[PDB]
Swiss-Prot record:
Belongs to the bacterial gasdermin family. Keywords: Antiviral defense, Cell inner membrane, Cell membrane, Cytoplasm, Lipoprotein, Membrane, Palmitate, Transmembrane, Transmembrane beta strand. The N-terminus has marked structural similarity to the mammalian gasdermin N-terminal domain. The C-terminal region wraps around the twisted beta sheet core, probably stabilizing the inactive state. Changing residue 62 to E: 100-fold reduction in toxicity of pore-forming domain in E.coli. Complete loss of toxicity of pore-forming domain in E.coli. One of its GO terms (cellular component) is cytoplasm. This is Gasdermin bGSDM. Changing residue 19 to E: 100-fold reduction in toxicity of pore-forming domain in E.coli. Complete loss of toxicity of pore-forming domain in E.coli. The chain crosses the membrane at residues 64-80, 92-109, 158-175, 184-200. Palmitoylation helps stabilize the inactive state; may self palmitoylate. Palmitoylation plays a significant role in pore formation. GO terms for biological process: defense response to virus.
Length: 228
């Protein structure tokens, strides 16, 4: 969760594996839970009028560094001391402890930003039929998934972000006695950890955040919404 939303305070969307060559008006689709690049915006419109809206380039943003952290832990103990018409256990013990922790540390320096006017995008679109020929847009025409258009995007030539996730569970169960002479006892312990660090220090500019204006075709009724 923090690994994809650490750039939510400043209104932006985190780009996993930040790369180079993601300009504005690069419409992208969000369906089946995932977000996928879908080429340039002009492919969506059957008749793209002349030139796409102009893109202002190389605007500074003073860089951003910070971290986010969360952790949830809880242990529950259940004890049975009688029969209570539920089988027959002299002492029944259950101990379930689960604790997870996530952390993200990001730092992008020498940050530039390039954007496009959403009103200019609307003027470029205005009255324009959506291309339903390509099957990729066919799903969105029927409302299978949402559609978004990248308007602003920031980049940096020097940055690093490291995320850590951990989760540990332990279930101990003790059921002696029972009507048959059996002493039951079993403990299950599970632990998972994951660390992912992606950095860059070269001279090339790699985008790592963007703003998405949601576009909606919905059987051709093209509308522009603010996506939260």
């Amino acid at each position: 969760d923090p690994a994809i939303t650490y750039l939510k305070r400043l209104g932006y969307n985190v780009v996993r594996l930040p790369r180079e060559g993601i300009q504005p008006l690069h419409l992208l689709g969000q369906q089946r839970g995932t977000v996928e690049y879908l080429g340039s915006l002009e492919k969506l419109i059957t008749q793209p009028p002349s030139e796409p809206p102009a893109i202002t380039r190389d605007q500074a943003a003073a860089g951003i560094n910070g971290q986010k952290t969360e952790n949830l832990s809880f242990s529950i103990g259940i004890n049975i001391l009688k029969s209570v018409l539920a089988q027959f256990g002299a002492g029944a013990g259950i101990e379930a402890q689960y604790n997870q922790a996530r952390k993200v540390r990001f730092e992008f320096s020498n940050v530039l930003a390039d954007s496009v006017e959403p009103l200019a995008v609307g003027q470029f679109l205005k009255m324009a039929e959506v291309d339903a020929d390509n099957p990729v847009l066919k799903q969105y025409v029927l409302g299978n998934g949402r559609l978004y258009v990248i308007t602003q995007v920031i980049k940096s030539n020097e940055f690093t972000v490291a995320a850590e996730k951990s989760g540990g569970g332990s279930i101990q169960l003790d059921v002696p006695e029972i009507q048959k002479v059996v002493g039951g006892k079993l403990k299950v312990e599970a632990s998972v950890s994951s660390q992912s660090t992606v950095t860059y220090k070269g001279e090339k500019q790699l985008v790592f955040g963007f703003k998405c204006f949601e576009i909606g075709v919905k059987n051709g009724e093209i509308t522009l919404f603010a996506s939260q």
